[PDB]
Amino acid sequence: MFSWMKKAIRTVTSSLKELYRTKLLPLEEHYRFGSFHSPALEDADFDGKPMVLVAGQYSTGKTSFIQYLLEQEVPGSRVGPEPTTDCFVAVMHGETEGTVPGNALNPFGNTFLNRFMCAQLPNQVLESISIIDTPGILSGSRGYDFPAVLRWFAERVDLIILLFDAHKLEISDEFSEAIGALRGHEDKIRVVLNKADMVETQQLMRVYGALMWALGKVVGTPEVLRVYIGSFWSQPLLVPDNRRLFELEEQDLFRDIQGLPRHAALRKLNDLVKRARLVRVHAYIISYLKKEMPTVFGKENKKKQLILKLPVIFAKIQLEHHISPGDFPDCQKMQELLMAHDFTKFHSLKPKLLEALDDMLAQDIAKLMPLLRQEELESVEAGVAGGAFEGTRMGPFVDAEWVVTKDKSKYDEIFYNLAPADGKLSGSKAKTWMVGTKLPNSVLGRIWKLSDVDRDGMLDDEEFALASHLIEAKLEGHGLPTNLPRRLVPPSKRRQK
Amino acid sequence: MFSWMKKAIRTVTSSLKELYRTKLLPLEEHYRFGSFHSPALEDADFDGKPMVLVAGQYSTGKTSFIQYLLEQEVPGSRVGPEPTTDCFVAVMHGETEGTVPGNALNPFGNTFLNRFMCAQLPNQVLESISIIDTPGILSGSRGYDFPAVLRWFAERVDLIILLFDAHKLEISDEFSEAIGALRGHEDKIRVVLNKADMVETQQLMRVYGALMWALGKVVGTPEVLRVYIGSFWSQPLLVPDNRRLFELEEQDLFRDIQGLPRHAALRKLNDLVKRARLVRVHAYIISYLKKEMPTVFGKENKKKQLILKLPVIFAKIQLEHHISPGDFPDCQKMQELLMAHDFTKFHSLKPKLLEALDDMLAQDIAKLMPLLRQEELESVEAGVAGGAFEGTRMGPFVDAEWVVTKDKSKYDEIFYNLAPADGKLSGSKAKTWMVGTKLPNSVLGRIWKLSDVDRDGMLDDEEFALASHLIEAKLEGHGLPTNLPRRLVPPSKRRQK
Numbered sequence: 001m002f003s004w005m006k007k008a009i010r011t012v013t014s015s016l017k018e019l020y021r022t023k024l025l026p027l028e029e030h031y032r033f034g035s036f037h038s039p040a041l042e043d044a045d046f047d048g049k050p051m052v053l054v055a056g057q058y059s060t061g062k063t064s065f066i067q068y069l070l071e072q073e074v075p076g077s078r079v080g081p082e083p084t085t086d087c088f089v090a091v092m093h094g095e096t097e098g099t100v101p102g103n104a105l106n107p108f109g110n111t112f113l114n115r116f117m118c119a120q121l122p123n124q125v126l127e128s129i130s131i132i133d134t135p136g137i138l139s140g141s142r143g144y145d146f147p148a149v150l151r152w153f154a155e156r157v158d159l160i161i162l163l164f165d166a167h168k169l170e171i172s173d174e175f176s177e178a179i180g181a182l183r184g185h186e187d188k189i190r191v192v193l194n195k196a197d198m199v200e201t202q203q204l205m206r207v208y209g210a211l212m213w214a215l216g217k218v219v220g221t222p223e224v225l226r227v228y229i230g231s232f233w234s235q236p237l238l239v240p241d242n243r244r245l246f247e248l249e250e251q252d253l254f255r256d257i258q259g260l261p262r263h264a265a266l267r268k269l270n271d272l273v274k275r276a277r278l279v280r281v282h283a284y285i286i287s288y289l290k291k292e293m294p295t296v297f298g299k300e301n302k303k304k305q306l307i308l309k310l311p312v313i314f315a316k317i318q319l320e321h322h323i324s325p326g327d328f329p330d331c332q333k334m335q336e337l338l339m340a341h342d343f344t345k346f347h348s349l350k351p352k353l354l355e356a357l358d359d360m361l362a363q364d365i366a367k368l369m370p371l372l373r374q375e376e377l378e379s380v381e382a383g384v385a386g387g388a389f390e391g392t393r394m395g396p397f398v399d400a401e402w403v404v405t406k407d408k409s410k411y412d413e414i415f416y417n418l419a420p421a422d423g424k425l426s427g428s429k430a431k432t433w434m435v436g437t438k439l440p441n442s443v444l445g446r447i448w449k450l451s452d453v454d455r456d457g458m459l460d461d462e463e464f465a466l467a468s469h470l471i472e473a474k475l476e477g478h479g480l481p482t483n484l485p486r487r488l489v490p491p492s493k494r495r496q497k
Numbered sequence: 498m499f500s501w502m503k504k505a506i507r508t509v510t511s512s513l514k515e516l517y518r519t520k521l522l523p524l525e526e527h528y529r530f531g532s533f534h535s536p537a538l539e540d541a542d543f544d545g546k547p548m549v550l551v552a553g554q555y556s557t558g559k560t561s562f563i564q565y566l567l568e569q570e571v572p573g574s575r576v577g578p579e580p581t582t583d584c585f586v587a588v589m590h591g592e593t594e595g596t597v598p599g600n601a602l603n604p605f606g607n608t609f610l611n612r613f614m615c616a617q618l619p620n621q622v623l624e625s626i627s628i629i630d631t632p633g634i635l636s637g638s639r640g641y642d643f644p645a646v647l648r649w650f651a652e653r654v655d656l657i658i659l660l661f662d663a664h665k666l667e668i669s670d671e672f673s674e675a676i677g678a679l680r681g682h683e684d685k686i687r688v689v690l691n692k693a694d695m696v697e698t699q700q701l702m703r704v705y706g707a708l709m710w711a712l713g714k715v716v717g718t719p720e721v722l723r724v725y726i727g728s729f730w731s732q733p734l735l736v737p738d739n740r741r742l743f744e745l746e747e748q749d750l751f752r753d754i755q756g757l758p759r760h761a762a763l764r765k766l767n768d769l770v771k772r773a774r775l776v777r778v779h780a781y782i783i784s785y786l787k788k789e790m791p792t793v794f795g796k797e798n799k800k801k802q803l804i805l806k807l808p809v810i811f812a813k814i815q816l817e818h819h820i821s822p823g824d825f826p827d828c829q830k831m832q833e834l835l836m837a838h839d840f841t842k843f844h845s846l847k848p849k850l851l852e853a854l855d856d857m858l859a860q861d862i863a864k865l866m867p868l869l870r871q872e873e874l875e876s877v878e879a880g881v882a883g884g885a886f887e888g889t890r891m892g893p894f895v896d897a898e899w900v901v902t903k904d905k906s907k908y909d910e911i912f913y914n915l916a917p918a919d920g921k922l923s924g925s926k927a928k929t930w931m932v933g934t935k936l937p938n939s940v941l942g943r944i945w946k947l948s949d950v951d952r953d954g955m956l957d958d959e960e961f962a963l964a965s966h967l968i969e970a971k972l973e974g975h976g977l978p979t980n981l982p983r984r985l986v987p988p989s990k991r992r993q994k
């Protein structure tokens with residue numbers, strides 16, 4: 001099985017590749033990292049185009065989202081209310097429109113990727129990045145391990161978009177399992193609250209709350225994840241109240257996903273750094289077992305013991321080598337994988353190699369930062385090209401004193417003549433006068449809303465003066481502001497700022 | 498120390514009181530509940546007025562909130578930016594305005610409530626309820642145990658209002674400790690996100706998120722807590738964008754706090770039920786120790802052991818008596834309190850009494866529900882009286898086919914004559930024409946925003962027809978809708994619903 005997915009001149013990118021093969025690869029290969037965690041990296045991992053993964057439950061809008069980013073339909077995947085997508089669609093660039101199934105790029109070492117399709121089409125966006133539509137996560141058995149495959153993408157992908165639909169939020173257990181697989185790559189996650197224009201403004205808040213309340217417990221990290229609220233959707237808004245917010249959030253995401261090529265080399269560095277640590281941990285985990293094993297006699301029991309003692313084995317290694325619990329892999333898995341290996345064949349601890357790795361992380365990596373910083377402004381305004389990211393899409397358009405004080409004393413005469421109690425005119429009394437202006441009820445309401453600044457249901461002299469001013473304004477032929485400007489707020493009422 | 502705070506005819510309330518003294522009090526008194534958890538209840542607990550507690554960090558707006566509920570200033574407490582309040586102000590009804598310090602209602606069994614003030618004033622709200630302003634929770638030592646006092650209120654109070662300020666959200670550790678004290682009384686909590694009109698609409702979402710992400714981990718319950726977003730504040734809105742939401746949330750809270758007298762007897766029942774369980778657990782916890790203790794010899798070691806074995810003691814009691822971990826108290830505390838007691842003096846297990854308690858919870862309590870249901874509609878439209886709850890405060894005010902189809906073919910002539918590409922007119926080209934109408938840029942923008950329904954930055958024939966229709970509309974002298982009604986959406990573009 002193999003991936004074509006990732007689609008002089010001494011660059012930080014190359015430097016990384018050279019560092020890997022020189023100071024990591026030996027350490028991986030000596031302690032057989034590839035037979036436990038992840039196989040040896042290839043040039044494709046360094047020279048390939050950046051990728052963005054899109055995941056979520058059924059009917060969350062993943063396929064729609066990609067289509068929306070593209071402003072164009074996906075050859076393979078189609079939109080539908082019932083579970084439609086049933087495979088991993090690797091939406092990537094193509095000279096001509098069309099698709100190609102799995103197995104097109106001796107696999108006697110057999111494949112189950114036959115359920116994996118590649119969609120190819122000519123598109124400005126696809127010149128910069130390659131998007132991956134995944135199958136819907138089950139909500140409430142399968143032919144393969146779904147978390148592990150996400151964990152596989154997590155190591156290689158640039159952005160992980162997780163969708164949730166405001167309409168029918170469900171944070172289900174197979175999902176809760178999925179997140180566990182992303183552990184260690186929190187920073188790549190971008191939670192998206194889709195269909196936010198479908199639920200009522202109050203309801204949206206509940207949903208949003210619940211989601212964060214949930215996600216808080218699931219990922220468990222103290223660093224809150226950024227959510228993006230919207231409807232990634234070329235169609236009209238069901239409820240428009242929160243239009244500004246959605247189109248603001250959209251942009252925040254689009255800017256973040258646009259700069260991926262510019263910020264490509266850094267994530268590679270960081271992910272290499274992250275790998276190094278797991279490699280290092282693994283090394284000690286193997287080495288320590290081989291040390292504990294006997295030469296020839298009584299080994300079968302010692303293996304059976306050691307695997308049961310593994311929790312203690314980790315704990316003891318954490319202490320004496322000063323390494324964060326977050327670096328260690330899931331014990332329960334190691335437990336299982338270690339059963340398949342011949343403990344006697346394990347290699348010894350070889351400080352020689354470990355030192356190289358350590359020195360890579362200590363100095364070599366520190367040295368590159370200067371260069372990287374230079375590369376991140378030397379020439380990096382490539383960005384994600386046209387599509388939905390295009391600017392034209394937004395459209396081709398885009399200290400004082402109170403102004404009624406001059407007419408104040410005129411209004412007061414009318415005010416106090418209407419018998420307000422305690423300097424306050426009742427709503428009942430205010431309406432019965434206001435309507436006397438012969439203005440449409442609707443307008444009079446909008447005036448009232450504006451004028452009752454302290455919102456107590458009554459009008460004092462200043463508020464009445466304001467109301468009157470507005471009534472005159474509209475009577476002369478003017479539009480009422482949807483919201484009062486600081487300027488029109490009666491001086492005494494204005495905020496302290 | 499004593500509380501005046503809680504300020505024929507066989508009623509559910511009395512029934513409860515009789516049940517308590519008959520089936521709980523003996524069990525409390527026999528195993529000395531009062532010297533461990535909470536003292537014997539008094540008539541004041543049953544016959545008193547309902548109370549609402551208000552807590553939060555410094556400058557969250559607690560005192561302001563109460564004042565806002567009252568529409569009137571608090572005699573004792575005053576508003577201020579720096580830490581002002583330094584005592585528990587029990588805002589309750591009063592015939593005349595004024596205050597009275599602590600110790601006004603042989604306390605040779607000495608008092609530290611001297612730092613506790615009572616504010617008294619005549620007010621319609623206060624006829625129904627009594628509010629409690631607390632000191633600000635520390636953010637980032639004291640003369641007393643602050644959580645425990647909250648735990649004391651938690652048992653007796655009807656609503657617990659927790660404030661957070663959107664402006665400067667801090668979920669601090671002394672707060673995180675406080676929540677622990679409320680454990681078991683989640684249902685009484687009402688989280689309030691204050692000052693929401695201070696931060697920008699996007700920012701508010703971040704804050705709100707972070708808060709729920711945090712609170713998720715802290716209370717730990719699977720049942721999400723209801724938050725109320727607003728600015729409980731008689732002054733004008735800094736940013737008005739989300740005015741509807743705030744005034745909607747406000748009402749949701751006010752309705753919830755208004756029905757407290759109507760729903761008073763139920764919470765008492767529930768809290769009695771909750772007490773019963775702790776009493777029952779405690780009984781077994783004591784009984785089991787007394788059983789484990791020797792008659793005369795070797796006891797000093799057995800006590801010292803038993804307290805260390807207490808975790809196991811609980812665990813073993815959970816199993817064999819089928820009781821939820823949530824019923825048990827904090828071990829670390831029991832550990833400490835049990836040191837002060839003479840184990841030999843403890844009473845034996847007395848199934849007689851336990852059975853009464855069990856039978857109360859099994860049948861007696863089940864029998865009352867019918868009655869309670871009858872009381873919750875017989876005559877219960879008392880509610881919280883006038884104040885901010887008054888209705889007048891809101892003010893005294895309060896299938897088709899497309900309408901441009903008739904003029905469609907007229908517009909198209911103009912459209913296609915302007916050389917749109919692929920049935921789509923560019924924004925550049927659309928603006929340069931639109932401005933030809935000699936309408937103010939601002940309006941033309943509002944039109945554009947309305948007309949570009951698919952929001953791709955271009956106008957197709959239908960959108961152009963719409964735009965034109967709107968241009969004619971305004972030219973004739975009409976207000977543009979802030980948002981397009983379903984009616985005006987071009988038929989082909991309308992949502993599936």
Ligand SMILES: Nc1ncnc2c1ncn2[C@@H]1O[C@H](COP(=O)(O)OP(=O)(O)NP(=O)(O)O)[C@@H](O)[C@H]1O
Pocket residue numbers: 056057058059060061062063064065078079080081082083084085134135136137194195198230231232233
């Ligand atoms: N932003 C949105 N607002 C409202 N409805 C939407 C939105 N996006 C998609 N839908 C509808 O919701 C359904 C799901 O859309 P779709 O893109 O098929 O989700 P999906 O996650 O790709 N399905 P699956 O691949 O089976 O998990 C479709 O019927 C869409 O019409």
Ligand SMILES: Nc1ncnc2c1ncn2[C@@H]1O[C@H](COP(=O)(O)OP(=O)(O)NP(=O)(O)O)[C@@H](O)[C@H]1O
Pocket residue numbers: 553554555556557558559560561562575576577578579580581582631632633634691692695727728729730
């Ligand atoms: N809803 C609001 N919006 C904006 N500012 C507010 C709001 N409520 C109160 N404030 C301001 O914030 C500060 C704190 O108000 P205050 O009611 O004193 O808080 P507090 O929690 O009672 N203080 P403390 O008792 O020491 O914790 C004051 O300066 C108020 O003017």
Ligand SMILES: [Ca+2]
Pocket residue numbers: 452453454455456457458459460463
């Ligand atoms: Ca007023």
Ligand SMILES: [Ca+2]
Pocket residue numbers: 949950951952953954955956957960
């Ligand atoms: Ca358009």
Ligand SMILES: [Mg+2]
Pocket residue numbers: 062063064077078084085
């Ligand atoms: Mg799909």
Ligand SMILES: [Mg+2]
Pocket residue numbers: 559560561574575581582
């Ligand atoms: Mg205060």
